[PDB]
From Swiss-Prot, chain A:
Disulfide bonds join 2-32, 10-29, 18-50. The keyword Ligase does not apply. Glycans are attached at residue 39. It is found in: Secreted. The chain holds residues 136 to 185 of 185 of the full protein. This is Ovomucoid. The lineage of its organism: Eukaryota, Metazoa, Chordata, Craniata, Vertebrata. GO terms for molecular function: molecular function inhibitor activity; serine-type endopeptidase inhibitor activity. The record marks 12-13 as: Reactive bond 3 for chymotrypsin, elastase, proteases A and B, and subtilisin. Avian ovomucoid consists of three homologous, tandem Kazal family inhibitory domains. Its main location: secreted. It comes from the Eukaryota.
Curated annotation (Swiss-Prot), chain B:
The chain holds residues 115 to 299 of 299 of the full protein. Monomer. This is Streptogrisin-B. Belongs to the peptidase S1 family. Keywords: Disulfide bond, Hydrolase, Protease, Serine protease, Signal, Zymogen. It comes from Streptomyces griseus.
Length: 50, 185
């Protein structure tokens, strides 16, 4: 659920998610911004670090 | 433990802002969005070394929180990494500043605007923030923004990253020091 994105800025607490690109995203706001940027190509692999 | 070091809650990792005190009671400042919902803080990922418990939190609208040290042995340095901090000051446009955080370490840059409104969504709006061209990334929240020996702000949020460049907004530290009746040492 990245419906509320993109966002101009994100808070910066670390709670990691692992993208389908095998990149660890630092928090959900960073991940959703990257999903937007990918035009919906990027997906979530699992919660936590990759 | 000093400004910029990692701090762990039950939900995630932030950075310690500044060590402060009131009389004999030692506390640390961090971001409000880190202290919201958090009770206990630890110094390691294993959550084996206690730091203390949240004493106050102001987020959204502002973005500052304060944690009361409950750990008697841990050194509570009045520094940012090795750097001495002796006073608090207000940011000005053009001021060269430095940030330290637990993900990216130390990065420098300048204040580019004051009193900015940042909308983090879901009704999480913060006002009166310092805008800079320093980068920051997840984990860096609550870390210090300083200028030589002067304490300026606490990391709130931003966009971009350290590899391509970013924009980061900080909560003015004087507002927090006044709110809690604490001082840098």
């Amino acid at each position: 659920d990245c419906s509320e994105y993109p966002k101009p800025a994100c808070t910066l607490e670390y709670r990691p998610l692992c993208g389908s690109d095998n990149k660890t995203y630092g928090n959900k706001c960073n991940f959703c911004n990257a999903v937007v940027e990918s035009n919906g190509t990027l997906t979530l692999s699992h919660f936590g670090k990759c | 433990i000093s400004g910029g070091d990692a701090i762990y809650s039950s939900t995630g990792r932030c950075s310690l802002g500044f060590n402060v005190r009131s009389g004999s009671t030692y506390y640390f400042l961090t971001a409000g969005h880190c202290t919201d919902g958090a009770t206990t803080w630890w110094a390691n990922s294993a959550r084996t070394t206690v730091l203390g418990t949240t004493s106050g939190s102001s987020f959204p609208n502002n973005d500052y929180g304060i944690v009361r040290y409950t750990n008697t042995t841990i050194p509570k340095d009045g520094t940012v990494g090795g750097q001495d901090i002796t006073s608090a000051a207000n940011a000005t446009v053009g001021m060269a500043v430095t940030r330290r955080g637990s993900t990216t370490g130390t990065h420098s840059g300048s204040v580019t605007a004051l009193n900015a409104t940042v909308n983090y969504g879901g009704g999480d709006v913060v006002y009166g923030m310092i805008r800079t061209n320093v980068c920051a990334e997840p984990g860096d929240s609550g870390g210090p923004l300083y200028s030589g020996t002067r304490a300026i702000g606490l990391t709130s949020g931003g966009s971009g990253n350290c590899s391509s460049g970013g924009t980061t907004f900080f909560q003015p530290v004087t507002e927090a020091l006044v709110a809690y009746g604490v001082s840098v040492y």
